[PDB]
């Protein structure tokens, strides 16, 4: 595949309400250090939980694009399903489709995860988790058109924008 | 701005 150009930098579970999904996060563009710094340990710990959401509307999306203009201040990741065998993969993929993509599209929202530094109740990083949508297609077309062509309307996925705040 | 999930 072409997922050697977009290496896996994190592997674990996402959570949303009472649902979970096993994913691999592929580095697309920006500053990979933000992924290492912002994402949790996945050696059996609690899942990465989406407990907030942001509307997919003009000023919200402008704010996300704002942090994406300099390569050191953001990280763009692509989330794809994974599992221990084909049967597990189908089930994890159905979870991603039904409990994450369908839900966020129906609410017209991106997931939001604020990541604090220990000792500070000010957010250090924000994870912005998009379903396939006009915004993700725009930026994936700009930054990784080969990757977008391989997944668009073909493979369920999420786009994750990590911003240091 | 944000809002909490269910």
Residue numbers in the entry:
A (entry chain A): 3500 to 3664
B (entry chain B): -1 to 4
What did the article's authors report about this structure?
The SPOC (Spen orthologue and paralogue C-terminal) domain is a 15–20 kDa protein domain found across eukaryotic species from yeast to mammals. SPOC domains form a distorted β-barrel structure comprising seven β-strands and a variable number of α-helices. SHARP (SMRT/HDAC1 associated repressor protein), RBM15, and RBM15B (RNA binding motif protein 15/15B) paralogues belong to the Spen family of proteins characterized by a series of N-terminal RRMs (RNA recognition motifs) and the C-terminal SPOC domain. Here we show that the SPOC domains of DIDO, SHARP, and RBM15 act as CTD reader domains that bind phosphorylated serines via conserved surface patches.
In contrast to PHF3 and DIDO, SHARP only required phosphorylation in a single repeat; double phosphorylation in adjacent repeats barely affected the binding affinity (Kd = 23.8 ± 0.8 µM for 1×S5P, 20.6 ± 0.1 µM for 2×S5P), which is in line with the fact that SHARP SPOC has only one conserved basic patch on its surface while PHF3 SPOC has two. To define the molecular determinants for the preferential binding to SMRT/NCoR, we solved the crystal structure of SHARP SPOC in complex with 1×S5P CTD peptide at a resolution of 1.55 Å. pS5 of the CTD is electrostatically anchored to the conserved basic surface patch of SHARP SPOC. The NH1 nitrogen of R3552 and the ε-aminogroups of K3516 and K3606 form hydrogen bonds with O1P, O2P and O3P of CTD pS5. The binding mode of SHARP SPOC to 1×S5P CTD is remarkably similar to the binding between SHARP SPOC and the C-terminus of SMRT. Both peptides occupy the same surface on the SPOC domain. pS5 of the CTD and pS2522 of SMRT are anchored via electrostatic interactions with K3516, R3552, and K3606. A notable difference between the two structures is electrostatic interactions between the SMRT peptide and R3548 of SHARP SPOC, which is coordinated by D2523 and E2525 of SMRT (dashed red circle). These acidic residues are also present at the same position in the NCoR C-terminus (SMRT: -YETLpSDSE, NCoR: -YETLpSDSDD), but are absent from the CTD (-YSPTpSPSYSPTSPS) impeding hydrogen bonding with R3548. The additional electrostatic interactions confer strong binding to SMRT even in the absence of serine phosphorylation and might explain why SHARP SPOC exhibits higher affinity for SMRT/NCoR compared to the CTD. Y1257 and Y1312 are not conserved in SHARP, which may explain the different modes of binding and why SHARP SPOC recognizes a single rather than two adjacent phosphorylated CTD repeats. Collectively, our findings establish SHARP SPOC as a phosphoserine binding module that preferentially binds phosphorylated LSD motifs with adjacent acidic residues but can accommodate different phosphorylated binding partners of SHARP via its conserved basic patch.
